[PDB]
Amino acid sequence: MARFALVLHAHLPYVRAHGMWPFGEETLYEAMAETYLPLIRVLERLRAEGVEAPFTLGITPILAEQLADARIKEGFWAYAKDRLERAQGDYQRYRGTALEASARHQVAFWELTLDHFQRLSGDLVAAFRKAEEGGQVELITSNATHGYSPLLGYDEALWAQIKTGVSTYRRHFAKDPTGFWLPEMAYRPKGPWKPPVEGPPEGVRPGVDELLMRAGIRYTFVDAHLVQGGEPLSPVESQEATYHVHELESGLRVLARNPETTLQVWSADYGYPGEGLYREFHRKDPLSGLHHWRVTHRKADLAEKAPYDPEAAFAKTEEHARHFVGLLERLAGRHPEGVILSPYDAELFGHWWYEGVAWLEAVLRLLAQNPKVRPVTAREAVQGPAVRTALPEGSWGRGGDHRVWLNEKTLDYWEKVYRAEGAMREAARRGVLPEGVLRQAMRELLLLEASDWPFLMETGQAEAYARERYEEHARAFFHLLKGASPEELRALEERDNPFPEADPRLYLF
């Protein structure tokens, strides 16, 4: 019986109080409305209808901290209300036109969004907790602020990232996490280590999995090429190694990403999202900002996008659900006792691929009654026979290594990260600065360590923004240690408020 472990990793860097658009609080509001709330509704249905098709969901600590924030909750409420009004306005403008059906859908969507958000008391974290409680999903944690594990300069800093993540998970769910999502699936085994830039001490460092083990984590995930060598997914076939559960020397277990299921969904040439009926991500209404057009054709110009047909688009998800399950059955036939790990960035479903969440639900419903492929949580997925394996260093990023986050444009970044991590450690040992100052400084360090900054600069999704973002957290960090006034500290505490119980002791041992 082949095991299918669907793993969704929900994440977004800290945008609370740092602007709204392009990349700001609105980015978080969109995800809540298009990905998280719809996902919660799927979970509620499956529980209500007794459908047994569990999967795994990761919510990075920094994301959960924002979702549970009063300002974000109120901000989302205003966002949704405003969107509903924009939808109602579009329905009157487009009534009787080719965009009517799409306009009606928008109204219905936002009405449901406001009503659902209101019925959950605007607390998404609580709903996910409820779903896990029902057994419909397993929740896993990650690095506090999604720091790039392999490159953090100090073991105590990586420890702080990991431990703060476990603590946040406990705080929000009143349970301990056994599963852990490695940001960018970036891994580094035990062994000699030399800093990429000046700062950190060069010497033997424990493997990332060793710290995870010490933190109570029992399993994580890595990209396919870490267990089967060869080319990364930057055609990459799935060797038998990728279908086995792997146990490291530390005792930690790892599953490897299945290439086929990843490409079948993400591919720009044949991924499901490219289907012509699906809603076009890149075309927004000049006046309302809403999406009323469909992909139509992958090559098609924006001006050539045809009107969006909501009904036809969502109906199409059933077809792709069957197709996907067909692929799972072939993979299963090839490895009847293997484990198929299909890990994705959660925002892919709902935000990038609008109909993607309905697709997920369709897939789970089909898998609940599938004799060849059994949907399981990560914990169940890692049980049974395992291959003793040693993992080389790498990630699931372009090139299968660290080039995306470590490069020409990000040298200054890691430079400041290393300096800051060392200072944090020292400040923690000295213990002379006020408790509050140490906690906020720690917060600034964590925010600075977000891999999202170097990522957004290399990709070009928001280079100037990301650059200013890390420079400011760095600036705030050293200013706090060098000496800031009580009111300057409070302004930073209010602006950057994640981790109310951040523990500076973590930088010691």
**Domains in the chain, CATH or no CATH each:** 2-405 (3.20.110.10), 406-509 (1.20.1430.10)
Within its chain, how far is the Cα of 135 from the centroid? Answer: 21
Amino acid (one-letter) located at 15: V
352 annotated to bind ligand: no
**Backbone conformation region of residue 174, classed left if phi is above 0, alpha if psi is from -120 to 50, else beta:** left
396 assigned binding-site residue: yes
User: According to the annotation, is 118 in a ligand binding site?
Assistant: no
How far is residue 479's CA from residue 473's CA, in Å, rounded to a whole number? 10
487 is known as an active-site residue: no
Hey, CA dihedral for 151, 152, 153, 156, is it positive or negative?
A: negative
- Whole-angstrom distance, CA of residue 134 vs CA of residue 47: 7
Contact assessment for residue 190 and residue 83, using Cβ atoms and an 8 Å cutoff = no
| 3-state SS, one letter per residue, for 246-310 | EECCCCCEEEEECHHHHHHHHCCCCCHHHCCCCECCCCCCCCCCCCCEECCCCCCCHHHCEECCH
Q: Which technique was used to obtain these atomic coordinates?
A: X-ray
Which of 249, 309, 318, 345 is flagged as catalytic? Answer: 345
DSSP string, 51-92: ----EEEEE-HHHHHHHT-HHHHHHHHHHHHHHHHHHHHHHH
State yes or no: is 345 an active-site residue: yes
Contact indicator for 308, 294 with CB cutoff of 8 Å: yes
Distances (CA, A) of 74 to 50, 77, 80, 123, 312: 33, 5, 10, 11, 34
- Which segments of 10-154 does DSSP mark as H helices, in order? 25-31, 37-48, 61-67, 70-94, 100-119, 124-134
Residue 103 class from Cβ within 10 Å (0-12 exposed, 13-18 middle, 19+ buried)? buried
CB within 8 Å of 288: residues ≥ 6 apart: 86, 87, 89, 90
- The answer on whether 496 is annotated among ligand-binding residues is no
* 461 has binding-site annotation: yes
- What are the Cα distances from residue 367, in Å, to 54, 135, 271, 328? 10, 16, 20, 10
Q: Is residue 201 exposed (0-12), middle (13-18) or buried (19+ Cβ within 10 Å)?
A: exposed
Torsion, Cα 47 48 50 54, to 10 degrees, reads: -20
Q: Which member of 138, 184, 275, 496 is catalytic?
A: 184
Side-chain half-sphere exposure of 223, counting CA atoms within 13 A: 27
Which is nearest to 77 in space by CA: 23, 107, 27, 33? 33
